[PDB]
Paper text:
To better understand the mechanism of 3D-domain swapping formation in c-[name]-[name] domain, and its plausible implication in amyloid fibril formation, we have solved the crystallographic structures of the WT and three mutants at position 128 of the c-[name]-[name] domain.
The Gln128Arg mutant crystallizes as an intertwined dimer, where 3D-domain swapping takes place by exchange of the RT loop of two different protomers and the n-[name] loop acts as hinge loop (see Results for a description of the structure of the protein). All the crystals of the dimeric form of the c-[name]-[name] domain belong to the hexagonal space group P6522 and show a single chain of the c-[name]-[name] domain. 3D-domain swapping of the polypeptide chains occurs as a result of an open-like conformation of the n-[name] loop (Asn112-Gly116) which acts as a hinge loop. On the other hand, in the Q128RD, the longer side-chain of arginine displaces W3, while W1 and W2 are placed at the same position; and in the Q129KD the sole water molecule conserved is W1, which is placed at hydrogen-bond distance of Lys128 and Glu106. Thus, the amino acid at position 128 is responsible for the hydrogen-bond scaffold around those water molecules. All the intertwined dimer structures described at this work show the presence of a PEG molecule at the interface of the two chains forming the dimer. Whereas the WT did not show a large pH-dependence of the Tm, our results confirm that: (i) the mutation of Gln128 to arginine or lysine, which bears a positive charge, results in the stabilization of the c-[name]-[name] domain, since these species unfold at higher temperature than the WT; and (ii) mutation to glutamate, which bears a negative charge, results in the destabilization of the c-[name]-[name] domain. It is noteworthy that, under the same conditions assayed for the WT c-[name]-[name] domain, we did not detect any aggregation in the Gln128Arg/Lys mutants, even though these mutants were also dimers at protein concentrations higher than 5 mg·ml−1 (0.72 mM).
Author numbering:
A (entry chain A), B (entry chain A): 84 to 140
The structure:
Amino acid sequence: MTFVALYDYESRTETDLSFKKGERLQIVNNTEGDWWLAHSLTTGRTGYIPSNYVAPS
Amino acid sequence: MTFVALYDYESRTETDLSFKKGERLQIVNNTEGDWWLAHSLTTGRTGYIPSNYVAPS
């Protein structure tokens, strides 16, 4: 349930978490699901998506 | 490899993808890994993290 940061990470947006190597992090249960980088074949746009919003096909 | 959007989603940041129900989406292989919502026990801050940057403990 608990994880440790392996590397420093600096936030790029208002929503990501900055952290230093060694921090202890706990995953937050979330209705959105894991986020994935996705490319829309329909529109050609690309960006992160909430995985609970999609299904295989 | 291909997914279908089950719901409309409007972008909240510069990095997420907006899409409409029915779009076909392809996952992009990514060095960052899936993103997770996490709470730092070390700093008390909370936000999304790249899962490849951490390890269980």
